[PDB]
Design a protein around this ligand. Structure first.
Ligand SMILES: O=c1ccn([C@@H]2O[C@H](COP(=O)(O)OP(=O)(O)O)[C@@H](O)[C@H]2O)c(=O)[nH]1
Ligand SMILES: O=c1ccn([C@@H]2O[C@H](COP(=O)(O)OP(=O)(O)O)[C@@H](O)[C@H]2O)c(=O)[nH]1
Lengths: 456, 432
């Protein structure tokens, strides 16, 4: 028997990459997988990853979810990826005929986390076992579950909110300062969507999380014990979700540059796929990379959407300034293969925004991190990485979207990262645990086998 | 539900590639695949390829076949690849407990053509549907089945059901020589093809004309197993490397101005022929990618072309727009790869089924094959005669037109509603 599993996708490489990786993991574990795509994708990288997956995995069927005519003026946010989520969610009642058509009959529908609220009833109407694909850390899933209860406890969310704490089941309490800045702003579409999704998480049969048990200490089995007692769906740790074979192009220009660099001497720098630094922070980060005295691979973005980042890096910095930076390290304003770079022996450290995929990729390849939170869940993710002993995260720097860090300060912490031996030692240790988790008899491999055997 | 299919592997890089490609094709068509391997492999290419398939297809399971001690004293031949076949066949009875142990329960056993006679009864014991993976052209397959009745009775010809008659001159050179281990197998196998459930041929309907349905109608009446057209067998994912030294060289060459020359993994040219093929490649005035199997002119050759004495990614070279033609030995795997990438080919048969394949290639309108050359093992060709033949190849526009036409016919065959896709789905919808 081979259980048929559907994947409901949403906007963003931060959501697509674990979706496609998990889809690949499923197919390699004797399951038939059907991914439900929507077009046109907000970014080009989204289109390529799907096509490459479908090319490398012909047995993965694609069914297109045609969304309703969307009026962006109705939505609160101006974020192209968030707007996409809502467009899908507003077309929720049309997924039902799409799913019934699918042959052979599905065993489970794996819903993307931003789409849980709107689409988990659709699975219930079809008596379909539904599972949440959570793309962030377990500590964030726990907050997003708890946050609806927290906001209901406040008369006014404006003034009564200083910097107290929000209690999390099984985790260290989260300060308001580590909470996604958009959460303070209820009546923001992102906030209202996550509040709804976190409320509906309990309606799913389980929650897929890109993590392994050794990463969080020994708190996960106890949490699930209490979750089962409280009638909540279990946390299903299936991470680290392995990168697909199409994510490895051995002949990339940045990879070839790395081959000429001393091992462990290069600082990889990136802030994800949907966020860009301010012009001032970009100019300062470039200054800090020169001051660091370390070889660096810097990935730059001036806009969120790659399609729209048409401006040459020259106009932002000046030809002279940019010409100077290229002398000290590799700089590219284009999509690069992150995990392929992270596995390169030349990379000794990673300056990241704190996105979970990047973080988990670094965990998987054993690269020490300097987490520089910019927005959203990156501060909560920062704290997870710090307690893991793999990364350092400068609380002094605050949020990147609201605080500016100058060149001298940036250069010193990169030095600290490059010479931080405890992070290096933990990196090798933590990587071997991640590998052991997906190997047969591993923690993650055990949970995935249990899921498939139930499907079936 | 996912049907579990077992692939019986034999030695031979020529036989391994279609097996590994059909194994992948099965997985991509929703089947669980278990390949039966034997170690140590004859060549590193086999070991490397098998490892790369297992590395890229974790869901495919490998169960090693441990064989009886071979007695290479007899050994009715000195060929390393053929000798292993008999070593596999001598221990055919030892497969039963292995195949039975395989879980989940198997739906079909795809057995490689050289071991059919010795392994088709093994499928009968397990109540398993048996399929033979034929690695050569359809014309060769009929010759293989019609040959045993023929020896039960030279410029003459052998009558072949469904095809043009084959001259004894195009028949494999070892076929005339009975008492050869190669022959004895082929005789036994050909008489045993009727015992199997289906013959899997790396081909599509359009390539052999509309004769395949008419044949299958006739085949069914006599109680014979059907011809299963599942071609072309597309190269696996591990069979493409974004940067190889040859690929980087092609990127500096004009579109379709390069002649690719390869004679397969098994065969090796004579020292005299290599020196003659070299001068002919210079005399052609063309760019060329030369694959050599076994100093003053070593520099001269590299001036207007590329020379390599190593395993290359053939299918990736043939996809490249810089390659305008293919000087091939005529191996059906190499031939079908040129069909897939629409590369017109100069067929130079050297041994075995290559004269037969050449006859199939000529009728396809995809290639030219020089009858004035005969067998490469039996004949030597001067540089002057070679160059003019390559020049005719590069300047043969009607070949290139039929080439581009056939690639579309081939590509449409594996697409949905295509020829090969239909027969494949029907097979798996019977297993089911
Ligand atoms: O230039 C880039 C930028 C992004 N990524 C990939 O995009 C994903 C982004 O994941 P993340 O958790 O950081 O989500 P995000 O912050 O981008 O929303 C990571 O897996 C990276 O490997 C990449 O390969 N190259
Ligand atoms: O230098 C080489 C020689 C062989 N091949 C591959 O090996 C297979 C050999 O198949 P063939 O029909 O020629 O069998 P052979 O005559 O070599 O035994 C072909 O598909 C080629 O793709 C290759 O990739 N590089």
């Amino acid at each position: 028997s081979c259980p048929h599993v559907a994947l409901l996708l949403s906007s963003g490489m931060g959501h697509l990459t674990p979706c496609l990786r998990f889809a690949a993991t499923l197919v390699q574990h004797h399951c038939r997988v059907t991914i439900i795509t929507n077009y046109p994708t907000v970014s080009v990288a989204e289109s390529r990853a799907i096509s490459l997956l479908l090319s490398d995995f012909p047995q993965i069927t694609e069914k297109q979810f045609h969304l309703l005519p969307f009026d962006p003026s109705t939505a609160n946010t101006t974020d192209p990826f968030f707007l996409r989520w809502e467009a899908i969610r507003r077309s929720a009642h049309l997924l039902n005929p799409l799913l019934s058509s699918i042959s052979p009959p599905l065993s489970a529908l794996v819903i993307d986390s931003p789409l849980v609220s709107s689409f988990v009833p659709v699975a219930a109407n079809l008596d379909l076992p539904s599972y949440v694909l959570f793309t962030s850390s377990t500590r964030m899933c726990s907050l997003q579950e708890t946050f609806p209860a927290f906001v209901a406890s406040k008369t006014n969310f404006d003034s009564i909110q200083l910097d107290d704490v929000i209690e999390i089941p099984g985790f260290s309490p989260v300060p308001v300062s580590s909470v996604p800045p958009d959460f303070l702003n209820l009546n923001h579409l992102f906030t209202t969507m996550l509040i709804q999704n976190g409320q509906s998480f309990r309606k799913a049969n389980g929650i897929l999380i890109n993590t392994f048990e050794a990463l969080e200490g020994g708190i996960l089995p106890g949490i699930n014990d209490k979750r089962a007692a409280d009638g909540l769906p279990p946390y299903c740790s299936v991470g680290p979700l392995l990168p697909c074979k199409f994510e490895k192009t051995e002949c990339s220009a940045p990879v070839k540059w790395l081959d000429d660099q001393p091992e462990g001497s290069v600082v990889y720098v990136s802030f994800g796929s949907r966020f860009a630094l301010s012009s001032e922070q970009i100019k300062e980060l470039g200054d800090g990379l020169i001051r660091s005295g370390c070889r660096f691979l810097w990935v730059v973005k001036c806009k969120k959407v790659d399609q729209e980042d048409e401006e040459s890096l020259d106009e932002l910095l000046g030809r002279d300034v940019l010409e100077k930076i290229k002398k000290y390290g590799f700089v590219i304003k284009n999509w690069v293969n992150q995990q392929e770079i992270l596995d390169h022996r030349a990379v000794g450290g990673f300056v990241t925004h704190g996105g979970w995929n990047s973080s988990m990729e670094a965990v998987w390849h054993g690269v020490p991190m300097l987490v520089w939170p910019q927005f959203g869940d990156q501060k909560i993710n920062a704290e997870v990485i710090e307690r893991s002993g793999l990364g350092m995260w400068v609380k002094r720097w605050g949020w990147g979207t609201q605080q500016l860090v100058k060149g001298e300060e940036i250069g010193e912490r990169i030095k600290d990262l490059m010479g931080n031996n405890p992070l290096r030692v933990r990196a090798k240790t933590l990587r071997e645990e991640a590998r052991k988790a997906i190997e047969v008899g591993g923690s993650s491999e055990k949970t995935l086998k249990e899921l498939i055997e139930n499907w079936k």
